[PDB]
Amino acid sequence: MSELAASLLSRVILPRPGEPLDVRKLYLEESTTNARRAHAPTRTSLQIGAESEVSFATYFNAFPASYWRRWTTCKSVVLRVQVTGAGRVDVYRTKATGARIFVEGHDFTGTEDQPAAVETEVVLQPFEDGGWVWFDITTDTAVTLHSGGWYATSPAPGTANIAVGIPTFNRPADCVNALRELTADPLVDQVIGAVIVPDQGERKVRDHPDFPAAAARLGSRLSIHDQPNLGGSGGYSRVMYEALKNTDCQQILFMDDDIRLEPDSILRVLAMHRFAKAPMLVGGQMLNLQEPSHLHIMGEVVDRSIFMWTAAPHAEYDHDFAEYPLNDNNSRSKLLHRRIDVDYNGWWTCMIPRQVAEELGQPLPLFIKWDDADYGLRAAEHGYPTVTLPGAAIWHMAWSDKDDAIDWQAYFHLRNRLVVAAMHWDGPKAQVIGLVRSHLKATLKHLACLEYSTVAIQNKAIDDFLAGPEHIFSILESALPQVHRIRKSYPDAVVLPAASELPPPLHKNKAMKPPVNPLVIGYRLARGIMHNLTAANPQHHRRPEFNVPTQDARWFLLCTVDGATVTTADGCGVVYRQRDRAKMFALLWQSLRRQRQLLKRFEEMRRIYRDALPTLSSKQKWETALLP
Amino acid sequence: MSELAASLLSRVILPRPGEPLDVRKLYLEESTTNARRAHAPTRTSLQIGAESEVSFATYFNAFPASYWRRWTTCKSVVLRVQVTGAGRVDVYRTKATGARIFVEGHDFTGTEDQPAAVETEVVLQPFEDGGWVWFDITTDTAVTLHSGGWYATSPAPGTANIAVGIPTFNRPADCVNALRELTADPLVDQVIGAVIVPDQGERKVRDHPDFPAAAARLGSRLSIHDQPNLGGSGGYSRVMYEALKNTDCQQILFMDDDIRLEPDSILRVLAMHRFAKAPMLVGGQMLNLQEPSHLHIMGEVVDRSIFMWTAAPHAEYDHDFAEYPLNDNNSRSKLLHRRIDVDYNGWWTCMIPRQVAEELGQPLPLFIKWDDADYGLRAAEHGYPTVTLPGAAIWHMAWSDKDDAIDWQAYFHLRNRLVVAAMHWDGPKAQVIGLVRSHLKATLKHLACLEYSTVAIQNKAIDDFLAGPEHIFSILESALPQVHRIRKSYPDAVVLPAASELPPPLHKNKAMKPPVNPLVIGYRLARGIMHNLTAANPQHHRRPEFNVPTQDARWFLLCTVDGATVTTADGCGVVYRQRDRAKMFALLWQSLRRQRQLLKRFEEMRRIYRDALPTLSSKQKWETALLP
Amino acid sequence: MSELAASLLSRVILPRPGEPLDVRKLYLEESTTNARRAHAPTRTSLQIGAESEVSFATYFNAFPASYWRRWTTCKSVVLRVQVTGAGRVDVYRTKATGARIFVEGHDFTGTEDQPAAVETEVVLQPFEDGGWVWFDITTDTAVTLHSGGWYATSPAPGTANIAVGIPTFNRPADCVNALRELTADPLVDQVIGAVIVPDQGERKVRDHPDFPAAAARLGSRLSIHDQPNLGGSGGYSRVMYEALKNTDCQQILFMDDDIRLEPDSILRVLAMHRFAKAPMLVGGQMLNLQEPSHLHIMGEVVDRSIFMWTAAPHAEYDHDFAEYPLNDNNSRSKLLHRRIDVDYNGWWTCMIPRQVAEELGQPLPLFIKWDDADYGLRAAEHGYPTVTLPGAAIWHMAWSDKDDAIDWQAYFHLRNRLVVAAMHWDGPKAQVIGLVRSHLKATLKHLACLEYSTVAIQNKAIDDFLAGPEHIFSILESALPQVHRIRKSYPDAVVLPAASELPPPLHKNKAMKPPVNPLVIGYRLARGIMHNLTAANPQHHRRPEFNVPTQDARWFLLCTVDGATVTTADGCGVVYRQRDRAKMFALLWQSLRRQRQLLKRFEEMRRIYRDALPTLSSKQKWETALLP
Ligand SMILES: O=c1ccn([C@@H]2O[C@H](COP(=O)(O)OP(=O)(O)O)[C@@H](O)[C@H]2O)c(=O)[nH]1
Ligand SMILES: O=c1ccn([C@@H]2O[C@H](COP(=O)(O)OP(=O)(O)O)[C@@H](O)[C@H]2O)c(=O)[nH]1
Ligand SMILES: O=c1ccn([C@@H]2O[C@H](COP(=O)(O)OP(=O)(O)O)[C@@H](O)[C@H]2O)c(=O)[nH]1
Ligand SMILES: [Mn+2]
Ligand SMILES: [Mn+2]
Ligand SMILES: [Mn+2]
């Protein structure tokens, strides 16, 4: 018992009372033939009826064996369940193809007075490519699973002193909640030493009514640091800065302020970090906050040849565990059993070892976007891999219709993408053509969609990149206001609350089906080009031709009109997109001029950016933008 | 009652407590409309709720009528169930198309005090092509099925004295368990007279802690015989040798050491043997140990025209009875109602009559593979057919991803295949071209997959075959070490624990979809041939181009690379396959030279092998390799 | 209450205790959401749980409205249910497309002490093309349906005195049972006045042990008449003969001896007959005895243009009410809502009014087959239509794999088909070419399948037809033995118990998939013709090339072989079909010669057959073959 608690890797957890049935599929998967639902008295125990089966082949309770095999020193894991009643524990593993293999099974008989203990040691040898381990319970009489867990065969190396960092910006209510959920589970609280909150917002988290109660439970492990708005980069950079200077914490764990939490997720990541073969970044997955049974992604990489972040080779976005169980014979579920290798983890949950952060230094001053990838790629170049752990997750806001890469962020995508590209493009010379051809495609689509402001702000992006690193650092704060100033000009960047704020449409909308037939995309594009050569009628800038819903607003519909309203992706307003031939060819020329500049000057940008990294990632340099 | 027990063919059995629901579909098939699961107090009884239906149209409890009709003297079978409660027994049969026919039905009323007995005599006449008989129970009040069985209308001929043979090699734990499960059911124990265990391993089954307890229950019906490693052939040959010389047992039942058991399976095979029209080999099916609701195969044959073991005409591998019930209108289930005729049964469970083994003599000294087929084909030539009984099964390890025919065994497949081919090729002359063309295909695929060691050891196989029978017998022990010595050379035959033991791959893996389009297999093969003509870059033998998962590693992916790691089929390690043009054309020439030798010298091999059979299958000759 | 019982059309009936769940779908259709199965205390009552729904949109309990509208004088029907508990009766109708229409609904509250009565009058007006009426029950508290029925709004015209006729031939056990099930329901017993059993068999129904008990319940309403074997024609002719001469029964109801019964079926047919607009034949459907949820057919017609009995225009054989409910949105179920018009009903249950049988006279002396159609077609020509009532059924043996039109019956099909054709071909002259072209197709298929005996006995059929009516009558008894004498010659007509009675096949059977591709049926037929021109190898008449299963034995497989065993359609034996070119061309010539004879002499056969009808259907003439 002394040694048990210090080798626990991940617990068997159940859902809270009154949790939606969709979300319960993350925890336990019950047979539709059982007479009654299973009951979860506490988050660690479960009551099962007589003559019933429940399967723990689930996102939260199954053991992601291949990952432990690959990155940790654990030769084998031990399942321990403590149960009363008569029944059977069946242990299964999978091959990386998803094929389920029955390992061993134990019949038990237990009473509340002499509770039955069931231990099974599963060797991690057969998980080179992938595979999970899990268990089912099948009952003779009624059964209570009092506790269950996956264990290593020796204590966890090192000490567990975690600096939790949570940068906040005008989301006090959410942040106060994140601080509240850290102290929920005693086993997390115990291993938290410091909690850094860089408050970059004008509506402060200290001012909240529920804060004192939340802050009291943390004691003086909590500090709040007021600084200017420096985005993600500045937020997390501050956390690193603090944890390395003002705490002696062995781990730095980046988190977001708008996250729901499964506290065992934190403990699982810590487990892997401590058991790692070599020092490494360890991150958690994100479940979708707005569709909570859905896993966002198993892991991301940066695709060379266009230098663009993307899904890892054998992983698809948005995996609904309620519709596609871990153990189903469907093709989406079969990919989950592969071991996914990432280039970086997102900063919703990402643990960085102390003397690794010290070595890599700070993040790049990118404001938002790409800061996290850069860090992953940088650590990789120093021999510190990143592992995105399955089964260890927080719930975060996804791009569940809500977001887009056409607004002000479109600047920060492109700009930072190039910055990071110069930083890590250790490859062939002629390769940069692939990224610029990549952008030309994007830029033609934008214009075809009448998203003019986007192109403009993207042309500022390429200008700002070409001015170098010294310049990027000085516009950490100034850049955001500058994007907005540019965007005010364009009717397509000015949100209006309703389309009824404008004169009713000339034409009622018609259902125009998505062309995915080769003959039809050829013709719909020809119509697009030719119309786009005619002089735009200005009557259509005063009265929109259509009231376009977000969903229906693609290249093929917008290339025929001169003016139309398009609903913002959140569905909170509309922009009045208005075609103009003169303004478009201008933007198109400026875009062409910048793309030619890029392939001409990229060799040069690699040299000057790589050289400037000790500065850009220095604590000393970040001091002059972080402290008043 | 005196006469009942001695005419019992197969009992109605239920699952153990806490058996997975998947596996219970082997026993009883319940209506999703029943209010509650059915309960199995004992392995022979079942409790059903009021207003409920359960169907015994299942692998274990249905009667494989066509088989009994074909091979046994039974004109009709009698169902006997003993039941309490009010309900109805409905008896069904099938045609060989799967079409279900209702035969008769009996309403019963029984109490525990005056239990109701229900007998139905089903005539076996209408089962020429195939068909099963089974029964359902449908309840008015709650019902208990106290016992149920299929009976012949007269006593079983002969006496039941079974020599059970279990050859073991370094699997003490498993073997001790097999000996334990034989004495489980009293009705099996009663008919076991001897249990021979040839222990060819250096980790002895006697040394096990649980052995004394297991051996005590057998008394002195158990002997253990220490001998050198002589593979399957030597193991089972020893069992035959012992049972014919040192026991007066009427039957010899071959078993494996790594098998879970349904004891009634043993009794069913014995039943058929005793009721046989003429003396015959009777075998049991294998269920998959690692996917326990799945039946491996209904029966195997040796396909003339390539002389290669294969699925019997109307049977497909891997039949999941949980997904495809015996009585479903699906195409996979419809094949189960045909009567499958085999050429041989596997030696997991195969019963050989005493004066049949005496007549046929020993097995061929093949070490592993084909020993069993040869025996089936040999018995066939003497007028002793083999029947693979459905419903009579043990659970055994299948090729559930775990195994492959590319490693050291690839020698023993080819070699023994040819040995056996010479032995039983009573057919046309020019026919041998079909086997050699068969091998040329295989050999080109191997090389294309960079599996060089395979070809090498297969070329030893053809050399060893051509040296004749006298020579094959002397290399019974020496051959295995010799294969390994040859395999050490090739990087593709040397297993390494992880791919991270090697330098990281040059390219990340890309999803390349299986080409089954005629235009695409033509082009993907053209790329294969042409690249395979270019000089291999040696930088790719020092740093692998890919980290290939087993599943993704086929001809079309491996024919483009010069070097890559491929994960072993168990998923326990990786080999570094490395292309070389010079070494390949060498192997290809040596393979071509041997194939030309075969068709030249096969007439000659038939003559010299057939002539040498009295020697190869002699007890006297096997003495000089079995006894120190 | 006085007037209720004499206007009852059909009762709401439930299944017996322990009836299979498949068959219960004929009676009531329960929601999978109900907490418990519904219970049927008695065959007329049903107990439903609280908060549950059951739908009586079922074969047995729904009202076939369109039929009642079309053929009876009933302007409207009345549903009456007597219920306790709180709940709601919902009444629905359908359009002939299957579209369900909600009519009205009644909330009830009843107690056992003051039981609630619910009456709904549904007008039959909107059922021109088809449509059903039914009701569902939906419960608040637990509900008991004590009784339910469909009623006319006035008493039944006429008196109900039914002569039940059951011809038996060597099936004593079955016949004794039919007599037992007539006296089961008191409401059937009451309306049965006589039961005629012509016993044409040598194993007499009187000799049975269970007969005296069965005969006692009938009193002296039962007579048994010994006569020679004169087949169906002679059996039923005898029943007519008796009921018209020796009873004063108002109805004659033909039945079979191998039928399970729903007694309300008898009452429903009687109901319609009594309520008929004009005098008419009224028949019941047949449910499949061996697949009891399956309806054989909604109704049959005689297809002019080939003069061949067939499914009525919008009806398909074999409708499984368990898989396709009356009220499902599937295409098979949608045809059930059309009103099917028949040309005749089968003699399993067919009611003939007294002064209609008197007018039409006896059946034709056809021995078996077509006797029933002829009678339907004859009655039609006199203005007496036939109606096949849905919901009124007996269970009878179908052609559920068991039967075929290639054996001795093949004579009686063709012969009688032509007899009947001459009798009723009131159409165009050149039309007979269509029947003879029809036969040429059949005859070429037979020969291609090596079914030589068939063609031979069919050529006797055409000879016997051409000899005229006077001759057909004299061979009523002699013809059956004569067919057998001819069949003894041919190896394909001699059944052997197993294929193992013959030398094992030269080739093992190969799976040859059904060609339904235009290119492939063209080639598979070309192979057929050309091989069929080569001289047959006689070694293949001594050792069969294959062991062909019934299912796999079609034109495309048999046209390539010279000799093979084919399993009888019951699966009880095999015939050795053996190709011969000399014997085949002979049969083919004799067939061609007869077909030329037919179209030459059909005008002549119409004249001589039609003229001979008063004789063939005379009671006086049938006397000389029915009485010793
Ligand atoms: O003007 C800004 C925009 C965002 N952020 C920070 O950048 C991170 C990511 O931004 P956001 O949450 O709005 O985008 P999301 O994560 O939802 O995609 C957050 O931690 C914010 O604190 C910031 O400091 N200032
Ligand atoms: O080096 C060996 C390899 C195997 N065997 C025997 O050969 C049989 C089949 O081998 P194995 O079980 O390893 O293969 P599998 O049956 O799983 O395919 C077993 O009964 C072993 O006892 C042996 O005696 N020596
Ligand atoms: O040799 C025969 C053959 C049959 N029948 C009668 O013909 C009818 C139909 O024959 P069967 O029942 O054998 O054929 P099925 O109705 O099953 O198709 C039955 O009522 C039999 O009594 C007969 O009298 N003598
Ligand atoms: Mn966020
Ligand atoms: Mn084995
Ligand atoms: Mn019949």
DSSP string, C393-416: EEEE---SSS--SSSTHHHHHHHH
Q: How buried is A322 (Cβ within 10 angstroms: 0-12 exposed, 13-18 middle, 19+ buried)?
A: middle
Q: What is the DSSP letter of A191?
A: T
Reported as type and span, the H/E element at residue B202 is none
Helix (H) or strand (E) holding C269: helix C263-274
Residues with Cβ < 8 Å from C267, sequence gap 6 or more?
A: C8, C10, C11, C187, C188, C191
Contacts of C410 (CB under 8 A, 6+ apart): C454, C457, C458, C461
Q: Identify the residue whose C-alpha is closest to ligand 3 atom 23.
A: C231
Q: Which residues of A are annotated as a binding site?
A: 171, 200, 229, 256, 258, 396
Report the separation in Å between the CA atom of C166 and the middle of ligand 3, taken as the mean of its atom positions: 11
Q: What is the C-alpha to C-alpha distance for residues A291 and A20, in angstroms, rounded to an integer?
A: 11
Comparing CA positions, the residue from B598, B603, B308 lying closest to residue B466 is B598
Distance CA(A357)–CA(A346), nearest Å, equals 16
User: C30-49 as b/e, with b when 16 or more CB fall inside 10 Å?
Assistant: beeebebbbbbeebbbbbbb
Q: Is A198 in the pocket of ligand 1 (CB under 6 A)?
A: no
In this structure, the answer to whether residues C356 and C414 fall within a common structural domain is no
Contact B423, B610 (CB under 8 A): yes
- B76 in contact with chain A, both atoms CB, cutoff 8 A: no
DSSP C535-573: PPPGGGTTS-S-EE-GGG-SHHHHTS-SEEEEE-TTSS-
CA atoms within 13 A on the CB side of C10: 28
A99 Cβ contact partners less than 8 Å away, ≥ 6 residues apart: B400, B401
Which residue shows structure tokens 């806001």? A397
B75 lies in the same domain as B143: yes
Residue C73 CA: distances (Å) to CA of B419, C12, C278: 86, 22, 9
Residues of B with Cβ-Cβ distance to A96 under 8 angstroms: 549-551, 567, 571
Closest CA to B357 of B227, B241, B473, B231: B241
The count of residues in chain C is 628
Residue with tokens 């020599």: B163
Tell me the three state secondary structure of residue B366. Answer: coil
Count the neighbouring beta carbons within 10 Å of the beta carbon of residue B532: 16
Q: Is the CB of C549 inside 8 Å of chain B's CB atoms? A: yes
AA identity, residue B406: I
Report DSSP state, residue A97. T
Q: How many angstroms separate the CA atoms of C263 and C189, rounded?
A: 10
| Closest listed residue to residue A423, CA positions, set A617, A264, A242, A143 | A617
Spacing, Cα B232 to ligand 5 middle (Å): 9
Q: At what angle do helices C479-487 and C452-466 cross, to 10 degrees?
A: 150
B384: helix, strand or coil: coil
User: Are β-strands A319-320 and A294-295 bridged in parallel, bridged antiparallel, or unpaired?
Assistant: antiparallel
Helices C371-381, C409-424: crossing angle, 10 deg rounding? 10
Residue C244 φ then ψ, to 5°:
-80, -30
* H-helix segments, B83-230: 172-182, 186-189, 211-216
- Regarding whether A508 and A393 lie in a shared domain, the answer is no
Ligand 2 pocket by C-beta < 6 Å: which residues?
Answer: B 167-169, 200, 229, 231-232, 235, 256, 368, 397
**Please, what sign has the CA dihedral across residues B432, B436, B437, B439?**
positive
Q: What is the DSSP letter of A39?
A: B
Which of B25, B29, B509, B551 would best serve as a mutation to test chain A binding (most A beta carbons within 10 A)? B551
Cα–Cα distance measured from residue B111 to residue C57, given in angstroms and rounded to the nearest whole number: 37
What does the radius of gyration of chain B's CA atoms come to, in whole angstroms? 27
Q: The tokens 């249950």 sit on which residue? A: C349
CB A416 within 8 A of CB A365: no
Q: Give, for C514, the enclosing helix (H) or strand (E).
A: none
Pairing mode, strands A162-165 and A251-255: parallel
Location of structure tokens 């090192």:
A158
Give the whole-angstrom CA distance, residue B512 versus residue A327. Answer: 24
Q: A91 and A120 in contact (C-beta within 8 Å)?
A: yes
A101 touches chain B (CB under 8 A): yes
- DSSP 8-state symbol, A537: P
Chain B CB contacts of C19 under 8 Å are: 88, 138
Q: Which helix (H) or strand (E) holds A497?
A: none
d(CA A579, CA A591): 17
- Phi-psi sector, C158: left (phi>0), alpha (psi -120 to 50), beta: left
Which amino acid is it at A235? G
Sign of CA dihedral C237, C239, C242, C247: negative
**Pocket residues for ligand 3 (CB within 6 Å)?**
C 167-169, 200, 229, 231-232, 235, 256, 368, 397
CA distance B414 to B439: 9
For chain C, positions 353-412, list CB contacts with chain B under 8 A. 400-401
Residue A266 to residues A10, A185, A372, C206, C244, Cα–Cα distance (Å): 10, 10, 19, 87, 95
What is d(CA C415, CA C622) in angstroms, rounded to the nearest whole number?
20
A98 touches chain B (CB under 8 A): no
Helices (H), B402-478: 409-424, 433-448, 452-466, 469-474
Do the Cβ atoms of B272 and B71 come closer than 8 Å?
yes
* Share of chain C residues as helix, strand and coil, in percent rounded to the nearest 5: 35, 25, 40
Q: What's the token pair of residue C615?
A: 């004789």
Experimental method: X-ray
**What does DSSP assign to residue C574?**
E
* Separation of alpha carbons B232 and B369, rounded Å: 8
Q: Which residue of B has its CA nearest to C509?
A: B313
Closest residue by Cα to atom 13, ligand 2, is B169
**CA–CA dist C379, C361 (Å, integer):** 10
In chain A, which residues are followed by a C-to-N distance beyond 2.5 Å, i.e. a gap?
none
Q: Which of the residues A185, A343, A371, A372 is marked catalytic?
A: A372
Pairing status of strand B222-226 against strand B143-151: unpaired
From A606, A598, A574, select the one nearest A505 (Cα to Cα). A574
Q: Has A372 been annotated as catalytic?
A: yes
Residue C315, H or E segment = none
Question: Given ligand 1 and candidates A368, A397, A483, which is best to mutate, with the most ligand atoms within 8 Å of its CB?
Answer: A368
Sign of dihedral through CA atoms C535, C539, C543, C545?
negative
Residues 6 or more apart whose Cβ sits within 8 Å of residue C534? C581
Residue B319 CB burial class (10 angstroms; 0-12, 13-18, ≥19): buried
> B185 in contact with C at a CB cutoff of 8 Å?
no
Bridge partners, C352 (sequence order): C252
Taking one residue from B and the other from C, the number of pairs with CB-CB distance under 8 angstroms is 85
Tokens 């925890």 identify what position?
A27
Write down which residue in B374, B403, B432 finishes a domain. B403
Residues C399 and C431 placed together within one structural domain of the fold: no
Residues 6+ apart with CB under 8 A from C10: C63, C149, C150, C264, C267, C268, C271, C391, C392
Q: What are the distances in angstroms from CA B69 to CA A461, B5, B77, B125, B345?
A: 84, 21, 10, 7, 19
How many Å is the Cα radius of gyration of chain A? 27
How far are the Cα atoms of C279, C306, C377 from residue C302, in angstroms, in the given order? 22, 9, 9
Residues B86 and B129 occupy one common structural domain: yes
Among A363, A383, A403, residue at a domain's last position: A403
| Residue from B164, B166, B169, B204 to probe ligand 2 pocket by mutation (most atoms less than 8 Å from CB) | B169
State whether residue C521 is helix, strand or coil. Answer: helix
Supply φ then ψ for residue A123, to 5 degrees: -75, 135
Token pair for C516: 């339904």
Chains touching C (at least 3 CB pairs under 8 A) are B
Q: Which CATH number fits the domain that encloses residue B90?
A: 3.90.550.60
Instruction: Tell me how far CA of residue B162 lies from CA of A117, B7, B196, B221, B350, in angstroms.
Output: 40, 17, 11, 11, 12
* DSSP classification of residue B156: P
- Side chain identity at residue A564, one-letter code: A
The binding site of A for Mn(2+) comprises 256, 258, 396
Could you tell me which residues come within 8 angstroms of residue B93 by beta carbon, excluding any fewer than 6 positions away?
B65, B100, B101, B103, B122, B126, B127, B131, B132, B133, B134
Q: Are residues C378 and C412 in the same domain?
A: no
Point out which residues pair with C130 in neighbouring strands: C338
Could you list the residues of C known to form a binding site for UDP-alpha-D-galactofuranose, using ranges.
171, 200, 229, 256
B334 Cβ under 8 Å from any chain C Cβ: no
| DSSP category for residue B335 | G
* Distance (Å) from CA A232 to ligand 1 centroid: 6
Q: Tokens 């919902």: give the residue.
A: C90
Closest CA to C505 of C555, C534, C537, C548: C548
Burial readout B144-176 (b: 16 or more C-beta within 10 A, e: otherwise): bbbbbbbbbeeebeeebebbbbbbbbebbebbb
**Residue A522, domain extent:** 404-628
Place of tokens 């049991």: B284
C613, C594 contact by CB (below 8 A): no
Q: Does C512 touch chain B (CB under 8 A)?
A: no
User: What are the DSSP calls for A108-169, one per residue?
Assistant: EEE-SSS-EEEEEEEE-TT-SSB--EEEEEEESS-EEEEEEEEE-SSPPSS---EEEE--BS
SS3 content of chain A, % helix, strand, coil (to 5): 35, 25, 40
Domain count, chain B: 2
Distance in Å, CA C396 to ligand 6 centroid = 7
d(CA A391, CA B621): 61
CA distance B60 to B618: 39
Q: Same domain for A509 and A421? A: yes
Which residues lie below 8 Å from residue A137, measured CB to CB, with a gap of 6+?
A48, A53, A54, A56, A81, A83, A87, A88, A89, A90, A143, A145
Q: How far is the CA of C348 from the centre of ligand 6 (A)?
A: 7
Cβ contacts of residue C305 below 8 Å, gap of 6+?
C431, C434
Asked if B131 lies within 8 A of C571 by C-beta distance, the reply is yes
- Regarding whether A383 and A460 lie in a shared domain, the answer is no
Q: Which chains touch B (3 or more CB pairs under 8 A)?
A: A, C
**Which domain-ending residue is among B351, B379, B403?**
B403
Same domain, C305 and C451: no
Q: Report the alpha-carbon distance of residue C42 to residue C45 in Å, rounded.
A: 5
Tokens of B372: 């069993």
Tokens in use for A537?
Answer: 């009628």
Say how far apart CA A371 and CA A346 lie, in whole Å. 9
Helix (H, G, I), strand (E, B) or coil at B488: coil
Question: What secondary structure does DSSP assign to C133-193, as a single string?
Answer: EEEEEEESS-EEEEEEEEE-SSPPSS---EEEE--BSS-HHHHHHHHHHHTTSHHHHTTEE
Cβ contacts of A100 on chain B, cutoff 8 Å? 291
Q: Which residues does chain C have within 8 Å of residue B139's beta carbon, measured at their own beta carbons?
A: 18
Task: Please judge whether A128 and B508 are an interchain contact, meaning their C-beta atoms are less than 8 angstroms apart.
Answer: no
Strand partners, C396: C259, C288
Distance CA A250, CA A255 (A): 16
Query: Residue A100 is encoded by which pair of tokens?
Result: 């389920």
Q: How far is C49 from chain B (nearest CA, A)?
A: 13
- Most distant CA pair in chain A, distance: 87
Same domain, B353 and B480: no
The secondary structure element, H or E, covering residue A379 is helix A371-381
CA distance A92 to A62: 10
A582 vs A452, A585, A588, B457, CA distance in Å?
Answer: 12, 6, 10, 74
Resolution (A): 3.1
Q: Concatenated DSSP letters for C209-231?
A: TTHHHHHHTTGGGEEEEE----H
Residue A351 identity: M
The contacts of residue A586 (CB under 8 Å, 6+ apart) are: none
Nearest CA to ligand 2 atom 5: B231
Cα C91 from chain centre? 31
Query: Are B326 and B427 contained in the same domain?
Result: no
DSSP states of A213-253: HHHHTTGGGEEEEE----HHHHHHHHHHHHHHHS---SEEE
Query: What distance in Å separates the CA atoms of residue A111 and residue A93, rounded to the nearest whole number?
Result: 29
Q: How far apart are CA C348 and CA C353, in angstroms?
A: 16
The Cα A542–Cα A491 span in angstroms is 11
Are C609 and C462 in the same domain? yes
Helix, strand, coil fractions of chain B, as percent rounded to 5 = 35, 25, 40
Minimal Cβ distance to A140: which of B18, B32, B573:
B18
